[PDB]
């Protein structure tokens, strides 16, 4: 069901209930709970963290994630493994830092190219976007949070994709990332419990700017 492999080499499947979560720009994450069995024994007693999970959603959606948390509980004469995991197109960014302090004016392609140095992944902007200046680089910081700042300045949203090619992850940067979807919803047909919340405690009609 779920093909997991060490960071070096071969795969091994396990059946387990999964709980995935995906946001637009924020990190996706999943969680699941393996249990000891006559099966799964060779794996469960031999998982070390940063085990590489993949083949969620079957023989498709080969979005390879990595485990970082590992719980191990004892239930009866058996044992559970709750665990968590994160994307490689995000973790692989949390891998590397930049020490050269980016500073001054910066066009978007230059900025999101210096940060994709050695990672191998690829970025591209769709529409024309302006440029601004970044005051202090994150010399002691991830590529990820500088990516956050860059999105906050220039590309207000993004969307990753595992392109057809191996070891590639195209970052379509875009303001207000969207694609049309043929499906739909309604209270009768697909929407059990509609909680509409309208929060306005920090809201505005006119506003000043300097």
């Amino acid at each position: 069901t779920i093909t997991i492999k060490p960071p070096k080499g071969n795969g091994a499947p396990v059946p387990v209930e999964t709980t995935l979560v995906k946001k637009v720009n924020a990190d996706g994450v999943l969680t699941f709970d393996i249990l000891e069995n006559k099966y799964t024994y060779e794996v469960i007693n031999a998982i070390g963290k940063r085990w590489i999970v993949s083949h969620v959603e079957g023989e498709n959606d080969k979005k390879e994630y990595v485990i970082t948390v590992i719980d191990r509980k004892s239930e009866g004469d058996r044992q559970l493994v709750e665990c968590t995991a994160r994307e490689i197109p995000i973790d692989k960014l949390m891998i590397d830092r930049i020490y050269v302090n980016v500073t001054g004016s910066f066009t978007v392609e230059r900025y999101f190219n210096i940060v994709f140095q050695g990672t191998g992944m690829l970025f591209e902007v769709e529409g024309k976007v302006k440029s601004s200046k970044f005051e202090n680089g994150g010399e002691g910081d991830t590529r990820l949070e500088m990516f956050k700042k860059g999105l906050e300045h220039f590309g207000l949203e993004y969307k990753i994709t595992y392109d057809k090619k191996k070891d590639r992850y195209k970052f379509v940067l875009t303001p207000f990332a969207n694609q049309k979807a043929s499906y739909f919803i309604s209270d009768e047909v697909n929407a059990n419990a509609i909680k509409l919340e309208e929060d306005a405690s920090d809201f505005a009609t006119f506003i000043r700017g300097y």
Binding site: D27, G28, V29, V69, T84, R86, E145
Partner: peptide
């Protein structure tokens, strides 16, 4: 009394992978 721990534990779980 028994209850604070479960919620705080799930909270600390959620502290993993909440941030870009």
């Amino acid at each position: 009394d028994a209850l604070t721990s479960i919620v705080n534990g799930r909270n600390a779980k959620r502290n993993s992978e909440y941030y870009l």
